[PDB]
Design a protein around this motif. Sequence first.
Motif, PDB file in Angstrom:
ATOM      1  N   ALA A  54       2.586   4.755   5.613  1.00 24.76           N
ATOM      2  CA  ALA A  54       2.438   5.572   4.522  1.00 24.76           C
ATOM      3  C   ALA A  54       3.456   6.721   4.213  1.00 24.76           C
ATOM      4  N   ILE A  76      -3.046  12.492   8.549  1.00 29.26           N
ATOM      5  CA  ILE A  76      -2.807  11.295   7.792  1.00 29.26           C
ATOM      6  C   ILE A  76      -2.268  11.633   6.564  1.00 29.26           C
ATOM      7  N   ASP A  77      -1.515  10.534   6.011  1.00 26.09           N
ATOM      8  CA  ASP A  77      -0.978  11.044   4.639  1.00 26.09           C
ATOM      9  C   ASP A  77       0.023  12.071   4.340  1.00 26.09           C
ATOM     10  N   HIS A 128      -3.996   5.852  -2.930  1.00 23.67           N
ATOM     11  CA  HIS A 128      -2.925   6.016  -2.626  1.00 23.67           C
ATOM     12  C   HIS A 128      -1.442   5.706  -3.216  1.00 23.67           C
ATOM     13  N   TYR A 135      -0.528  -2.791  10.531  1.00 21.54           N
ATOM     14  CA  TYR A 135       0.392  -2.097   9.694  1.00 21.54           C
ATOM     15  C   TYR A 135       1.718  -2.067   9.792  1.00 21.54           C
ATOM     16  N   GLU A 178      -7.915  11.620   1.515  1.00 27.10           N
ATOM     17  CA  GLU A 178      -6.633  11.197   1.811  1.00 27.10           C
ATOM     18  C   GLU A 178      -5.722  11.067   0.829  1.00 27.10           C
ATOM     19  N   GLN A 232       3.722   8.205   9.162  1.00 26.53           N
ATOM     20  CA  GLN A 232       2.924   8.280  10.289  1.00 26.53           C
ATOM     21  C   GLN A 232       2.852   7.348  11.405  1.00 26.53           C
ATOM     22  N   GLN A 244      -1.846   2.163  -5.757  1.00 25.28           N
ATOM     23  CA  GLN A 244      -2.455   0.857  -5.172  1.00 25.28           C
ATOM     24  C   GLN A 244      -4.040   0.548  -5.705  1.00 25.28           C
ATOM     25  N   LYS A 254       0.624  -1.282  -0.086  1.00 28.23           N
ATOM     26  CA  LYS A 254       0.027   0.045   0.131  1.00 28.23           C
ATOM     27  C   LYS A 254       0.818   1.232  -0.066  1.00 28.23           C
ATOM     28  N   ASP A 255       0.010   2.524  -0.263  1.00 22.45           N
ATOM     29  CA  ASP A 255       0.877   3.816   0.123  1.00 22.45           C
ATOM     30  C   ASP A 255       2.120   4.015  -0.517  1.00 22.45           C
ATOM     31  N   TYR A 293     -11.877  -3.124   5.993  1.00 23.75           N
ATOM     32  CA  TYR A 293     -10.947  -2.480   4.921  1.00 23.75           C
ATOM     33  C   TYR A 293      -9.664  -2.752   5.421  1.00 23.75           C
TER      34      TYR A 293
HETATM   35  O1  LIG Z   1      -2.486   2.184   4.696  1.00 22.96           O
HETATM   36  C1  LIG Z   1      -2.615   2.910   6.043  1.00 22.96           C
HETATM   37  C2  LIG Z   1      -3.739   4.041   5.583  1.00 22.96           C
HETATM   38  O2  LIG Z   1      -4.942   3.472   4.828  1.00 22.96           O
HETATM   39  C3  LIG Z   1      -5.047   4.505   3.662  1.00 22.96           C
HETATM   40  O3  LIG Z   1      -4.499   3.626   2.501  1.00 22.96           O
HETATM   41  C4  LIG Z   1      -4.352   5.756   3.989  1.00 22.96           C
HETATM   42  O4  LIG Z   1      -3.971   6.300   2.775  1.00 22.96           O
HETATM   43  C5  LIG Z   1      -3.094   5.245   4.831  1.00 22.96           C
HETATM   44  O5  LIG Z   1      -2.671   6.239   5.636  1.00 22.96           O
END
Ligand SMILES: OC[C@@H]1O[C@H](O)[C@H](O)[C@H]1O
Length: 302
Positions: free
Chosen positions: A79, A135-136, A254, A51, A188, A96, A278, A28-29, A288
């Motif tokens: 991220a 975030i992000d 993202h 994560y 985001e 983050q 992604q 991801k991200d 999610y």
């Molecule tokens: O992957 C962790 C969080 O979920 C989303 O993908 C967001 O962009 C990210 O900060």
Amino acid sequence: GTCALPSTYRWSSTGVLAQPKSGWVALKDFTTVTHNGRHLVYGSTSSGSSYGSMVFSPFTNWSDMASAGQNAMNQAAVAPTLFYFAPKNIWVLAYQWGSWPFIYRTSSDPTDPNGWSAPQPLFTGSISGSDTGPIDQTLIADGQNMYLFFAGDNGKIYRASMPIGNFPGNFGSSYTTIMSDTKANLFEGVQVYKVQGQNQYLMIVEAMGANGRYFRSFTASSLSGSWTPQAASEGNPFAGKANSGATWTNDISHGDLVRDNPDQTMTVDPCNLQFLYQGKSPNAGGDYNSLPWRPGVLTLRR
Ligand SMILES: OC[C@@H]1O[C@H](O)[C@H](O)[C@H]1O
Ligand SMILES: [Ca+2]
Ligand SMILES: [Cl-]
């Protein structure tokens, strides 16, 4: 030999470029630079229950990402934002979730997932009306100031700045609220870039569309200036189901435009624009945090 950004975007897409190694359900991200002629990619990971982060072993062609080593970071950098900070000859990885709302580490070798320095505070502020908090993040400097941009899963985009001479450093608690819209419109995944050969910056922001995640684009003449919507609806997006050319995913989510120059100006070449994003199978459901996100690359069509 300079190009301009188009008012309407059309892309072609790769298929899924890699599967997560055993133990992860998602990659991801993404953040990416070209480093010594090879793609250098960091990203978040998910097991579904937590994560983390990782770096891919450097690879020359996107078609070889599938065979690239996947190297977990021993301390998560969720991220992440990767760049070379030329004024101090040092690489920076910002992220983050840690001791502060945003964090960074530094290194002289960005290929090593565990060669990064001790974590330092990047941002210590707080925002209202957000389930996630800041975030992000992304970071971008012009010739004078270093900027921090971030989102809040709440329809707002935020910005902070410091003289470049003071970076790497802590932005502290203060920020400016620069954009305000519905949660769906400015969600985001905010990224900001300098358009090479134009007196223009490009911001992309991930939105939640009727048909899936997509990106809305905005332009400015200066990083401290006003942002004007460019391709900013689901039907005419920067990148989304409408124009991605991707069949494997209805979500464009993202990631990072491909930056050939790895430095802090986040410069992209509008003549050869590509987007590492992604995406996920339209069939994938469940919570999610367990969704099977995968890397793809969009290439802008002439
Ligand atoms: O992957 C962790 C969080 O979920 C989303 O993908 C967001 O962009 C990210 O900060
Ligand atoms: Ca990012
Ligand atoms: Cl500011």
